Design a protein around this ligand. Structure first.
Ligand SMILES: OC[C@H]1O[C@H](O)[C@H](O)[C@@H](O)[C@@H]1O
Ligand SMILES: [Co+2]
Ligand SMILES: [Mg+2]
Length: 387
């Protein structure tokens, strides 16, 4: 089974199945894909929608005339298939003019160009129905310590995002922004390198309600961080506007493997969390079919993204529905974690001799947490071994 349907909200970037396979040491192994063909092929696989950078859809430098005909062709394909465009973004990283960044380039004229390029694509994204506009500052950073005053760069980053919020507000657009963190690559260090740094930065913007995060599985894992934990903090703050799903094997270059590959247990706990928290946004795959593959392998890899999500959803649901797991959760006092520590208040806590003076520290220390039996039940459910 595990057949995806549009109700599952699976989306793909044009640049994912369309990756030609050029890497830092090798030329392209696949021919370029027509965006119209990607839309139709993804619709056949059961996808909900597609996403795009401006430069995926309209070749850079296109005249106003050529730009109109690229968009027309694309909208005809969306109209024919019923495919949605829930998110769009700007390419502020490929062209050599962005080699020192877009919003935080040292040259002021580049920063102004970056803003105009972005504003132009927001207009298009809103016209096509996008609800989220993602910013990935892939070139915002440095290879050396003196090249970037990071306090001034954060001033310029705040200035850019504040201007974008003023723009969508003045136009009455119903679109929100999501910042996508990445710790490094292609810059030696990238500004706002993790979910945490991005969440903290948003709270200093003029209109923080317009901005959230687009965390990516592989990017947090490039810092050796726990991705489900970081997603939990984003949900706790009300800022999980969008998500990038893929796989990554540890701390190394950004692999963008198909979802499910890489850290499989982390994928299980991620799906458990998204489903139990009721996340309602797109399940977006930002992945690269390996350059070893031909076009048949491209579509097998894309199908695998959706299949692995659906299998993990089933296994996490069975885990949470198992009365034996519910008993284990109680034995590990997960339910006591939900209770307030001191709803009786500070003064009651201070006068509670059972909380300190008469607290039996050795009896409490002796209690086992029973975490290993709970985790083996989780392993049994993930592997379908509950028999
Ligand atoms: O911002 C949208 C996308 O742009 C680029 O392709 C980045 O590599 C990817 O991580 C990001 O999700
Ligand atoms: Co990535
Ligand atoms: Mg991404």
């Amino acid at each position: 089974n595990y057949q995806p349907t549009p109700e599952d909200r699976f989306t793909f970037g044009l640049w994912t199945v369309g990756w030609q396979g050029r890497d830092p040491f090798g030329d392209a192994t696949r021919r370029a894909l027509d965006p119209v063909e990607s839309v139709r092929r993804l619709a056949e696989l059961g996808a909900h929608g597609v996403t795009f950078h401006d430069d995926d859809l309209i070749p850079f430098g296109s005249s106003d005339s050529e730009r109109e005909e690229h968009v027309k062709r694309f909208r005809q394909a969306l109209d024919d298939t019923g495919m949605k465009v829930p998110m769009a973004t700007t390419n502020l990283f490929t062209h050599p003019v962005f080699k020192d960044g877009g919003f935080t380039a040292n040259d002021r004229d580049v920063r102004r160009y970056a803003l105009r390029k972005t504003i132009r694509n927001i207009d298009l994204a809103v016209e096509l129905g996008a609800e989220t506009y993602v910013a990935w500052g892939g070139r915002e950073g440095a290879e050396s310590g003196g090249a970037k005053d990071v306090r001034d760069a954060l001033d310029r980053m705040k200035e850019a995002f504040d201007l974008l919020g003023e723009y969508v507000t003045s136009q009455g657009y119903d679109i929100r922004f999501a910042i996508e963190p990445k710790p490094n690559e292609p810059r030696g260090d990238i500004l706002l390198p993790t979910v945490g740094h991005a969440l903290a930065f948003i709270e200093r913007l003029e209109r923080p309600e317009l901005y959230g995060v687009n965390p990516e599985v592989g990017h947090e894992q490039m810092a050796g961080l726990n991705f489900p934990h970081g997603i939990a903090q984003a949900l706790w703050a009300g800022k999980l506007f969008h998500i990038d799903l893929n796989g990554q094997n540890g701390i190394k270059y950004d692999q963008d493997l198909r979802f499910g590959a890489g850290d499989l247990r982390a994928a299980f706990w991620l799906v458990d969390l998204l489903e139990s928290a009721g996340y309602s946004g797109p399940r977006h795959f930002d992945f690269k079919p390996p350059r070893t593959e031909d076009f048949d392998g491209v579509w097998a890899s894309a199908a695998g993204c959706m299949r692995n999500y659906l299998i993990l959803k089933e296994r996490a649901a069975a885990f949470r529905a198992d009365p034996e797991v519910q008993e284990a959760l109680r034995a590990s006092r997960l339910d006591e974690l939900a209770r307030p520590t001191a709803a009786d208040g500070l003064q009651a806590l201070l006068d509670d001799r059972s909380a300190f003076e008469e607290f039996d520290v050795d009896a409490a220390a002796a209690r086992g947490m029973a975490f290993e039996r709970l985790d083996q039940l989780a392993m049994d459910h993930l592997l379908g071994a509950r028999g």
